[PDB]
Symmetry: D2
Subunit: 359 residues, 4 copies
């Protein structure tokens, strides 16, 4: 019994999540992506967008389009591995989405227009049973980070949840190892050298909610506030109020890195931390936290499925010698790729626990 899934908003964020799901080999097997709602319904265009990608290369599977019924001008259905995905048109209120009629049980909310728990809940009225906001959320939606606290998902209590942000999914795994291994965190500050994104502008333009963010993205280092570090406190309560940080948007299309500076809760050493991080990578954090000890640069992390990738050499080479509390930890993350898989990983976990709850 495959999972009936619907993706609300088939923008750049939605596609990656769908491509993620495909590469893992879940389409038509584990997950039945029934539909994808969006303001556009030209499947031929959606096929072109999946087929090519400036940063992630060419799609692994062939993509064809077709009509849902002979009585349709331009194709309105996506085809991948014989799996048919219907392209539905956007709706003002999520409650008006044909979710029930479509049989969609799990809807991936990625429009960025419904990050408020209450709003995202509309999908439920529209017939959905569970929603995953593919970004930070307000209103009190349960926030879950794979590999950190996803086992806290409660089928009967959590119907609208958030998979947090791509940056939190990079930082949290590092902090989670520190708090779980006993190094602990007294206070911390994080900085993320972040690739520019879709909200930024090519040339200087109007951006009322963030003036710096309206400046030419590919030719500027653009400072920015962020809530990713504070959010780690929701996934790991013991760090609430002890962490925060910023972001520097730099001229790269994809891939970012985490620069965490913190004071451990007890004497330790950078080598001791290096070992703990590596060890966790091969054990309880496998698939979520990985590491590298080669001379890598941002391009070498394009398409890496891990949420966080510890940079051993950079860490070990840039810490105070013989220091026991004040440390720096560098960890990479393909902001688009890692997160997209986490979103899929989370839907499968939820489905799994919802399933075992009806026995």
């Amino acid at each position: 019994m495959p999972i009936k899934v619907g993706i609300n908003g088939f923008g750049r964020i939605g596609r990656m999540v769908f491509q993620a799901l495909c590469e893992d080999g879940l389409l038509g097997t584990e997950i039945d992506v029934v539909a994808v709602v969006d303001m556009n319904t030209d499947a031929e265009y959606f096929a072109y967008q999946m087929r090519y990608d400036t940063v992630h290369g060419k799609f692994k599977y062939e993509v064809t389009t077709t009509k849902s019924s002979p009585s349709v001008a331009k194709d309105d259905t996506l085809v991948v591995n014989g799996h048919r995905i219907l392209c539905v048109k956007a709706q003002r209120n999520p409650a008006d989405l044909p979710w029930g009629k479509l049989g969609v049980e799990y809807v991936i909310e990625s429009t960025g227009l419904f990050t408020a728990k209450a709003a995202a809940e509309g999908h439920l009225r529209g017939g959905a049973r569970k929603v995953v906001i593919s970004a930070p959320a307000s209103g009190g939606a349960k926030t879950l980070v794979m590999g950190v606290n996803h086992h806290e998902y409660n089928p009967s209590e959590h119907h609208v949840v958030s998979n947090a942000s791509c940056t939190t999914n990079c930082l949290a795994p590092i902090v989670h190892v520190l708090v779980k291994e006993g190094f602990g965190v007294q206070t911390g500050l994080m900085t993320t050298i972040h690739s520019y994104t879709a909200t930024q502008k090519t040339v200087d333009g109007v951006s009322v909610k963030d003036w710096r963010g309206g400046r030419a993205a590919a030719v500027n280092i653009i400072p920015s506030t962020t809530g990713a570090a504070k959010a780690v406190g929701m996934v790991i309560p013991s760090t609430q109020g002890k962490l925060t940080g910023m972001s520097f948007r730099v001229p790269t299309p994809d891939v970012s890195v985490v620069d965490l500076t913190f004071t451990a809760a007890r004497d330790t050493s950078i080598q001791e931390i290096d070992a703990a991080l590596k060890r966790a990578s091969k054990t309880y954090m496998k698939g979520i936290l990985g590491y590298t000890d080669e001379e890598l640069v941002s391009a070498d992390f394009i398409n890496d499925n891990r949420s966080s990738i510890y940079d051993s050499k950079a860490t070990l080479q840039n810490n105070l010698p013989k220091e026991r509390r004040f440390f720096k930890i560098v960890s990479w993350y393909d902001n688009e790729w890692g997160y997209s898989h986490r979103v899929v990983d989370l839907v499968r976990h939820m489905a799994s626990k919802d399933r075992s709850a009806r026995l």
Copy 2:
């Protein structure tokens, strides 16, 4: 008193058109910028946007703000060395703007939303007497290129006109010299290696009307159709149907280059052509057509106010020796700066003609 002007759409062109005004010592004497309209009326933001430009440097003149009336919450007025500009709130429809209440006789239309003559005439209903669309128009609006056919402005017939595009303003001057000097243009094709603009995207995004135009701007050479070359047959009638061309959007925030290939109407040489352009540059095309014979690159043309800078060295070193018909002409232009000065020149020319006609 000075010409009362209003700027609808304070973006790249609106602001650079303004810089041109201040720079040339026209503000308060020849031209009076009564107001500027954009998404908000928050002068502080307008000031910040004018004060700093990532490609054209810091505004050399001091900009401050004030309120039009204490009954106002936030400052809504810009002050540039004692000159006051009211920040009017954007209107979906031009006819709604308070041009009348402001005494605006000339309005620069630079939002990129009302390039249709019919839509632009909304400003006249608002109390404006003339309008210059800072882009190619449709609906039968007269098109004018300073240095080429601007003396075709008919005070009592043309009320809503178009100052063409940046590319046409770079091309036309060249073709005009070719036709006037008697070399002639039998057939021609041009390619413009163009800098990205506000219409493009930072990361692969949605662009139903121009699929290629939706791909990441600063990491792709993006082909694109353009009417710039065809529009020349609308300014230089004898070229109608003989020219056209394409564009290649590349990773630079500003400055572009026209690469024109053509067959002359008679036997010549690239040397004779070189001489003529240089000559016109120093004479009847001065101010509009300039030239360089140095090893310059795009950044070297940032802030050049001519409409076309003939690149002599590049032209002379890349043509068929002894050829007498098939030629290539390379010419640069600061797509933002040059064109913005042209808009101002156009308004001033219209204001003098208008006075003459009312004698």
Copy 3:
């Protein structure tokens, strides 16, 4: 039966050629890269340079290192998928290389510092027999272009050949089709919007031989002269003195595009030419000349091993309607990748016309 090859100058093209050779699965079966010579001998550093590529992704095969003999300090042997390559030291003079000791006949010259057929001939008196210059050659060295004139190879007359340039390899196939098809070419000028290369500078720097080429590469559009067009005349004598052109280095790491403007030797149509290029691609030019009809941009050609990919839409949409002589043809090419595969395709041709023609 495994041949014998030796790459001199293991840089971008050297590694791209070696990688190309592996991609086609020739490492061991048909080709056997005996050894490679470059700057240092740090086998560890070579492998790292092979594992990761900023634009071409991560290498397909697994790479590791060992020692040719315990007698040597650091490693000096690559173990790509099993094969064993030796990192012989590089000499300032090609003659000083021990190609005889290792017995290497076919030596890929990719250092980019030995163009003269005399200097790049030292490989012969150094032990090697046949030498291939991965770049335009001088001193009268036979120039060959797969799909165009590579059959003009004389086993006993040609011992130091050239594979031409990336650009020549992209332009030639188009010209070839045009000529061979009967359209013919009276005159033609070509412009290539080209990505920056290793010879350029990250920031404005010294470059006596080419001032423009000395300016900041990733932020400027830089003009340059090129021989590519004239070079075609050497490969298709029918066009000698009929073609020339220039380049424009733009802010992209790889992938370029040719923009050819020409007058046919007879009356035709852009449609009749479009059809022939497509036909030639599927037939006698397959593998050398490809084509697309989708909304592609530079990034979409990354890793395309065709020498020239004709852009049907960019072409059919940008030519003069009803024209029959003056035309514009657009064709792409991964300057690093395509040329690399051609180098292998050539080295293999220079072998099949030896073991089947004299053995």
Copy 4:
């Protein structure tokens, strides 16, 4: 009378120093560049590089060229705004330079190859009474940072000094105010988001002594160690062993920013720290340390001559609320412009103390 100066190594930094020297209007009156020795003699080329800059705009002073004496073959003299500057040929040893013959007492060592105190000594044997190394130096050379410890310059003891690096000139002022204002530094880690430099490469190349540094510069976030932090321990001894940090080279041609994270020596608040830095920039750090409180990005610091420009908004908005020990401070710098002005400043300072010590 005017300070007779010489600039060994007229590379980019050598040029920036000269332009800065001119920008301060010191050329001819308060300092005269007798000559500028470099590996190249092509004065015309010198005039070209000085005339245009892809990031700093066009030179505000006219530069022409002539011969020192009709007997001289090519032009060997640069004529700047009137002042005459000779282009001497480079030597293998400073002592071989005509410094004394020319009457050059202060030589600006910026060839980057005479870093060693002993090496840089040769200039003294040649006649020069003082040498300033425009970069970190070794061999027991006095390191001086304007506004921080330049008053530690000993006329008769320090004849060969270092002006440190761009980064140290940004961090030092910040730390200096922290220490001088009574906050103190217990421990500190610094991260600099740094724009690429001349030693990096356009495409993946060879960097035997820095694998990451060899990767494509304008398309990667490239990690890197740095001495700036530790180097501060020379200027401000109390911090020795307390500070260290790294670097992240990003896709920008110029302008960088320091991200400092530290623990104060006493309890404070970010407000208190913020107020102090501002007060200091307005007083004893005037000209060296500046601050901003506007929404600025990298482009806005281009041509800023301060050594460090504190970012108040970014600092205040990104620190732990109510924190009293663990803080983060953000400060910008035009790694090319600021440092170039400091160099000039150091020479002017020395020249001053040297004379007052013998009056």
